[PDB]
Short mmCIF file of C-alpha atoms and ligand atoms in Angstrom, two decimals:
data_model
loop_
_atom_site.label_atom_id
_atom_site.label_comp_id
_atom_site.label_asym_id
_atom_site.label_seq_id
_atom_site.Cartn_x
_atom_site.Cartn_y
_atom_site.Cartn_z
CA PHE A 253 0.00 0.00 0.00
CA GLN A 254 1.15 3.52 -0.86
CA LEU A 255 -0.10 6.82 0.57
CA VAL A 256 2.23 9.50 -0.85
CA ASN A 257 2.97 9.93 -4.56
CA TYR A 258 6.22 11.90 -4.39
CA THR A 259 6.00 13.07 -8.03
CA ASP A 260 2.39 14.35 -7.88
CA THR A 261 2.23 18.10 -8.43
CA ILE A 262 1.43 19.48 -4.95
CA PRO A 263 3.48 16.74 -3.14
CA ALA A 264 6.43 17.22 -5.51
CA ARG A 265 6.06 20.97 -4.98
CA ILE A 266 6.39 20.38 -1.22
CA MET A 267 9.33 18.05 -1.95
CA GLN A 268 11.07 20.72 -4.03
CA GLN A 269 10.36 23.28 -1.29
CA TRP A 270 12.10 21.31 1.42
CA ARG A 271 14.94 20.26 -0.92
CA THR A 272 15.58 23.95 -1.65
CA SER A 273 15.29 24.85 2.05
CA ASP A 274 17.91 22.16 2.67
CA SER A 275 20.21 23.37 -0.12
CA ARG A 276 20.08 27.03 0.96
CA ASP A 277 21.99 26.69 4.21
CA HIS A 278 21.71 23.43 6.22
CA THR A 279 19.30 21.23 8.19
CA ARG A 280 19.44 18.15 10.45
CA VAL A 281 19.89 14.38 9.77
CA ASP A 282 19.94 13.43 6.09
CA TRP A 283 17.51 12.06 3.52
CA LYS A 284 16.86 10.07 0.26
CA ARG A 285 15.17 7.21 2.18
CA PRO A 286 11.93 8.89 3.30
CA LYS A 287 9.31 7.92 5.88
CA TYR A 288 5.54 8.24 5.77
CA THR A 289 5.60 9.29 9.44
CA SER A 290 7.47 12.46 8.45
CA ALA A 291 4.80 13.19 5.84
CA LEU A 292 2.13 12.69 8.51
CA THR A 293 4.12 15.02 10.79
CA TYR A 294 4.21 17.74 8.12
CA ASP A 295 0.51 17.35 7.36
CA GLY A 296 -0.43 17.38 11.05
CA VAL A 297 1.49 20.59 11.65
CA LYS A 298 -0.32 21.99 8.59
CA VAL A 299 -3.62 20.89 10.22
CA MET A 300 -2.68 22.72 13.43
CA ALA A 301 -1.62 25.81 11.47
CA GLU A 302 -4.89 25.92 9.51
CA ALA A 303 -6.82 25.40 12.76
CA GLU B 1 29.66 5.33 -6.81
CA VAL B 2 29.16 9.08 -7.22
CA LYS B 3 31.34 10.45 -10.02
CA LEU B 4 31.55 13.94 -11.51
CA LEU B 5 33.77 14.92 -14.44
CA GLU B 6 34.33 18.49 -15.63
CA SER B 7 35.40 19.33 -19.17
CA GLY B 8 35.87 22.31 -21.45
CA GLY B 9 38.58 24.03 -19.41
CA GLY B 10 41.95 25.33 -20.51
CA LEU B 11 42.73 28.69 -22.10
CA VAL B 12 40.40 31.42 -23.37
CA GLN B 13 40.91 34.87 -24.85
CA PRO B 14 39.86 38.00 -22.90
CA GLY B 15 36.42 39.30 -23.85
CA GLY B 16 35.16 36.09 -25.46
CA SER B 17 32.82 33.38 -24.23
CA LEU B 18 33.45 30.07 -22.49
CA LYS B 19 31.30 26.99 -21.85
CA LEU B 20 32.25 24.36 -19.28
CA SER B 21 30.39 21.06 -18.98
CA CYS B 22 30.11 18.75 -15.96
CA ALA B 23 28.86 15.19 -16.47
CA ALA B 24 27.55 13.08 -13.59
CA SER B 25 27.41 9.31 -13.21
CA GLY B 26 26.29 6.99 -10.43
CA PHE B 27 23.43 9.15 -9.13
CA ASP B 28 20.26 10.92 -10.28
CA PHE B 29 20.88 14.50 -11.38
CA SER B 30 17.13 15.07 -11.89
CA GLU B 31 16.48 15.21 -8.13
CA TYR B 32 19.81 16.35 -6.67
CA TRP B 33 20.80 20.01 -6.80
CA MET B 34 24.13 21.14 -8.25
CA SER B 35 26.55 23.90 -7.33
CA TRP B 36 29.56 25.64 -8.85
CA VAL B 37 32.38 27.22 -6.83
CA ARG B 38 35.53 29.00 -8.01
CA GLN B 39 38.97 29.01 -6.41
CA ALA B 40 41.79 31.42 -7.16
CA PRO B 41 45.39 30.14 -7.35
CA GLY B 42 46.85 30.30 -3.85
CA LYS B 43 43.70 31.86 -2.37
CA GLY B 44 40.53 30.51 -0.79
CA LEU B 45 37.48 29.17 -2.55
CA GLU B 46 34.51 31.24 -3.71
CA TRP B 47 31.01 29.93 -4.38
CA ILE B 48 29.88 30.98 -7.86
CA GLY B 49 26.32 29.73 -7.53
CA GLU B 50 23.86 26.89 -7.20
CA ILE B 51 21.06 25.48 -9.35
CA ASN B 52 18.16 23.12 -8.64
CA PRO B 53 17.13 20.00 -10.56
CA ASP B 54 14.00 21.42 -12.23
CA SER B 55 15.86 24.54 -13.53
CA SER B 56 13.42 26.90 -11.80
CA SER B 57 15.70 28.88 -9.46
CA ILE B 58 19.41 29.42 -10.12
CA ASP B 59 21.07 31.43 -7.36
CA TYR B 60 24.45 33.14 -7.60
CA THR B 61 26.63 35.68 -5.83
CA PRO B 62 25.50 39.34 -5.96
CA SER B 63 28.84 40.52 -7.42
CA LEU B 64 29.20 38.08 -10.35
CA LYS B 65 25.73 38.04 -11.90
CA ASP B 66 26.43 39.77 -15.23
CA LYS B 67 29.09 37.26 -16.34
CA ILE B 68 27.86 33.82 -15.17
CA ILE B 69 25.04 31.61 -16.46
CA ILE B 70 24.17 28.21 -14.97
CA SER B 71 22.09 25.57 -16.77
CA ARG B 72 21.57 21.83 -16.47
CA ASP B 73 20.29 18.83 -18.43
CA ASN B 74 18.58 16.04 -16.49
CA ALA B 75 18.24 13.84 -19.59
CA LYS B 76 22.01 13.95 -20.15
CA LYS B 77 22.65 14.63 -16.40
CA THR B 78 25.18 17.34 -17.30
CA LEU B 79 25.51 20.84 -15.88
CA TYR B 80 26.74 23.76 -17.99
CA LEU B 81 28.44 27.00 -16.97
CA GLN B 82 28.64 29.89 -19.45
CA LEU B 83 30.96 32.86 -18.91
CA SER B 84 31.00 35.99 -21.08
CA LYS B 85 33.54 38.85 -21.22
CA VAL B 86 36.22 37.14 -19.16
CA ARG B 87 38.80 39.25 -17.32
CA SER B 88 42.16 38.65 -15.66
CA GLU B 89 40.36 37.47 -12.50
CA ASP B 90 38.75 34.63 -14.49
CA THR B 91 42.02 32.63 -14.42
CA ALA B 92 40.89 30.26 -11.66
CA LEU B 93 39.85 26.68 -10.96
CA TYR B 94 36.10 26.14 -11.17
CA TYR B 95 34.52 23.13 -9.50
CA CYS B 96 31.09 21.59 -9.95
CA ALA B 97 29.74 19.82 -6.88
CA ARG B 98 26.67 17.91 -5.62
CA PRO B 99 24.29 19.35 -2.99
CA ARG B 100 26.54 20.15 -0.03
CA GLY B 101 24.18 22.44 1.87
CA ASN B 102 21.31 20.01 1.39
CA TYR B 103 22.78 16.59 2.25
CA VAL B 104 25.96 16.25 4.30
CA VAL B 105 26.26 12.50 3.62
CA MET B 106 25.78 12.88 -0.15
CA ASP B 107 28.21 15.81 -0.31
CA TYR B 108 30.73 15.23 -3.10
CA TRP B 109 32.71 17.66 -5.25
CA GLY B 110 33.88 17.08 -8.80
CA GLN B 111 37.37 17.65 -10.15
CA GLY B 112 36.68 21.01 -11.81
CA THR B 113 38.54 22.73 -14.63
CA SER B 114 41.15 25.48 -14.79
CA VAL B 115 40.50 28.59 -16.90
CA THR B 116 43.43 30.84 -17.84
CA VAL B 117 42.74 34.14 -19.58
CA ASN B 135 30.90 38.40 10.60
CA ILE B 136 32.38 34.91 11.04
CA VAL B 137 36.17 34.57 10.85
CA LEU B 138 37.55 31.03 10.59
CA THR B 139 41.23 30.81 11.57
CA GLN B 140 43.20 27.59 11.10
CA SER B 141 45.92 26.33 13.42
CA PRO B 142 48.69 25.90 12.53
CA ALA B 143 49.59 27.30 9.11
CA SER B 144 52.04 24.50 8.27
CA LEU B 145 53.07 21.34 10.09
CA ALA B 146 55.19 18.26 9.37
CA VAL B 147 54.02 14.88 10.68
CA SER B 148 55.65 11.49 10.14
CA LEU B 149 53.97 8.45 8.61
CA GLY B 150 51.62 6.45 10.81
CA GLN B 151 51.20 9.25 13.36
CA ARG B 152 48.19 11.29 14.54
CA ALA B 153 48.01 14.97 13.57
CA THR B 154 45.71 17.62 15.03
CA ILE B 155 44.40 20.72 13.24
CA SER B 156 42.38 23.32 15.15
CA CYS B 157 39.95 25.92 13.85
CA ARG B 158 38.61 28.99 15.66
CA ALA B 159 35.37 30.74 14.69
CA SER B 160 34.66 34.38 15.52
CA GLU B 161 30.88 33.89 15.79
CA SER B 162 28.72 31.04 17.07
CA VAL B 163 28.41 28.36 14.39
CA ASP B 164 26.30 26.03 16.56
CA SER B 165 22.67 25.71 15.48
CA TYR B 166 20.09 23.21 16.84
CA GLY B 167 22.76 21.08 18.50
CA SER B 168 24.77 20.35 15.33
CA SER B 169 27.91 22.23 14.28
CA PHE B 170 27.50 22.81 10.54
CA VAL B 171 31.19 22.84 9.61
CA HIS B 172 32.82 20.76 6.89
CA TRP B 173 36.48 19.74 6.70
CA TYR B 174 37.98 19.14 3.25
CA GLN B 175 41.45 18.44 1.83
CA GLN B 176 42.63 19.97 -1.46
CA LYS B 177 45.95 19.08 -3.07
CA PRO B 178 47.89 20.72 -5.92
CA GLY B 179 45.91 19.75 -9.00
CA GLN B 180 43.32 17.79 -6.99
CA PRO B 181 39.92 19.11 -5.88
CA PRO B 182 38.79 19.40 -2.25
CA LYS B 183 37.10 16.15 -1.26
CA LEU B 184 34.53 16.47 1.53
CA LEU B 185 36.28 14.50 4.26
CA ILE B 186 34.39 15.38 7.47
CA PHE B 187 30.76 16.53 7.59
CA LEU B 188 28.97 18.25 10.51
CA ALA B 189 32.12 17.93 12.73
CA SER B 190 31.11 14.46 14.02
CA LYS B 191 30.59 12.20 10.97
CA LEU B 192 32.97 10.66 8.45
CA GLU B 193 32.04 10.75 4.77
CA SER B 194 31.48 7.60 2.73
CA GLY B 195 34.37 6.32 0.64
CA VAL B 196 37.04 7.91 2.84
CA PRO B 197 38.56 5.36 5.27
CA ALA B 198 38.50 5.53 9.08
CA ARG B 199 41.56 7.75 9.34
CA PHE B 200 40.05 11.19 10.09
CA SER B 201 37.87 12.19 13.04
CA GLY B 202 36.39 15.46 14.24
CA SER B 203 35.47 17.05 17.55
CA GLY B 204 35.09 20.43 19.22
CA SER B 205 32.64 22.78 20.88
CA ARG B 206 30.94 25.93 19.64
CA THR B 207 34.07 28.10 19.27
CA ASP B 208 36.86 25.57 18.64
CA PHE B 209 36.81 22.67 16.17
CA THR B 210 39.53 20.03 15.89
CA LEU B 211 40.26 17.50 13.15
CA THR B 212 42.45 14.50 14.02
CA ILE B 213 44.26 12.22 11.56
CA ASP B 214 45.20 8.71 12.71
CA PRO B 215 47.12 7.02 11.16
CA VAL B 216 49.03 9.45 8.93
CA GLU B 217 49.61 8.26 5.36
CA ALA B 218 51.85 9.71 2.66
CA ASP B 219 48.98 10.48 0.25
CA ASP B 220 47.27 12.80 2.76
CA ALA B 221 49.86 15.56 2.21
CA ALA B 222 47.55 18.37 1.10
CA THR B 223 45.91 21.58 2.34
CA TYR B 224 43.14 21.13 4.91
CA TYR B 225 40.29 23.63 5.07
CA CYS B 226 37.41 24.03 7.51
CA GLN B 227 34.38 25.89 6.16
CA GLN B 228 31.19 26.84 7.98
CA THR B 229 27.97 27.75 6.16
CA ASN B 230 25.71 28.36 9.17
CA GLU B 231 24.69 31.90 8.20
CA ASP B 232 25.59 34.57 5.66
CA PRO B 233 28.30 34.85 4.46
CA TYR B 234 29.50 31.31 3.71
CA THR B 235 33.18 31.70 4.55
CA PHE B 236 36.09 29.32 3.94
CA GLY B 237 39.20 28.36 5.85
CA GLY B 238 42.64 29.88 5.56
CA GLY B 239 44.29 26.66 4.41
CA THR B 240 46.66 24.47 6.44
CA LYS B 241 49.18 22.41 4.49
CA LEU B 242 50.18 18.94 5.71
CA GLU B 243 53.79 17.81 5.28
CA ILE B 244 54.80 14.14 5.39
CA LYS B 245 58.14 13.58 7.10
CA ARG B 246 60.70 11.16 5.68
C1 NAG C 1 1.86 9.37 -9.43
O1 NAG C 1 3.05 10.00 -10.00
C2 NAG C 1 3.35 9.57 -11.34
C3 NAG C 1 4.62 10.25 -11.76
O2 NAG C 1 4.38 11.55 -12.28
C4 NAG C 1 2.17 9.90 -12.27
O3 NAG C 1 2.46 9.42 -13.58
C5 NAG C 1 0.89 9.27 -11.74
O4 NAG C 1 -0.21 9.64 -12.56
C6 NAG C 1 0.64 9.70 -10.30
N1 NAG C 1 -0.55 9.06 -9.77
C7 NAG C 1 -1.52 9.73 -9.15
C8 NAG C 1 -2.69 8.92 -8.67
O5 NAG C 1 -1.47 10.95 -8.98
#
């Protein structure tokens, strides 16, 4: 089962946004093997922000 | 593995145009960002610019915008740098590199090509001679606080004469892939320290510690390593 299509337009836009925010200065622990829990974390913080 | 090869360098007349290509192999250039950085002969490095995979935002320095153009090709996985109206300051070594600000583990710099027409990071010492099989120590002092969110975003690289600076140590506590277990890093918030154990003969180069925590992204002064015999 798959939840996140990483190449779909709004998800790949979010992907490009955090890749650019990485490549501008720096962030924490690295990438290229993602997790769906991090996607749920991002979407839950977006839920709290919209609320 | 990750491999980058630059081509098109050499000599160029003053006032003309120049196009340098950089081919990649072993990774996906259509997702990973690219960067280009110049280095004068005998001086420190200087970041020319960076470009994303989708070719939507290409950033550069504010003082070299009218003479640099960065493009890329994800189908051929090759980056292209175009320079117009070259001057006497254009005689330098350019270097194409993978995303170094983005991913510290996937940080890798290509060989580059030679073209012939406040945070203060102090290295310690300027020059030292260590024998083979020993352990050398190189210190670095920062004028401002480079610590952010618990991690010290400082990279330690080694550049030789004719060889590009390979990213040896990332984030002051992790060793890069491909390099053997012969270099470690430590320090705290004003003083960083790179240790080499054991000392080999091929490690005789110039070590540089560079921090990119905030603007401006400075580079180290350069500390040469001499192998005793
Ligand atoms: C998932 O992404 C691929 C790659 O672009 C696309 O071809 C496909 O239509 C997408 N599927 C959905 C359901 O969006």
